Amino acid sequence: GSGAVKLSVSYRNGTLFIMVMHIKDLVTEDGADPNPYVKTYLLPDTHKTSKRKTKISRKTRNPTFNEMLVYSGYSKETLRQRELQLSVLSAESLRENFFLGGITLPLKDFNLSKETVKWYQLTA
Numbered sequence: 823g824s825g826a827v828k829l830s831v832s833y834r835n836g837t838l839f840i841m842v843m844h845i846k847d848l849v850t851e852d853g854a855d856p857n858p859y860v861k862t863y864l865l866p867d868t869h870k871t872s873k874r875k876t877k878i879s880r881k882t883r884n885p886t887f888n889e890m891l892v893y894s895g896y897s898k899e900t901l902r903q904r905e906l907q908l909s910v911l912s913a914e915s916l917r918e919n920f921f922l923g924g925i926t927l928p929l930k931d932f933n934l935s936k937e938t939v940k941w942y943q944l945t946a
Contacts, residue, residue: 823943829842831934842891844886845944849922858910861873861876861910861911862891862907864896910923925944
């Protein structure tokens, strides 16, 4: 299943709010507890300014973040032509950080006039 992430997606005062609440069931291909963090981009990214990331959650497959990722300066019209590429990676200090799972969500699928809160299944 690769795990699932709970997110709150809302938009107010011209700002997109992505709250990464928590993740459950991440899997590594080696039985070691990863050091997960979440990274998002809004694509396509004309100016190369959309990278956002949470802090690192140490040794766990079920991290709780409760972190708000903020994307300001976008109109709702522009967002309808953007996808939220969310990636969960393990932060590693003696080897390359590795991909645990992710999901791409077209913002057009969201009623950005309200707050959408739900769990999303990650893919690999």
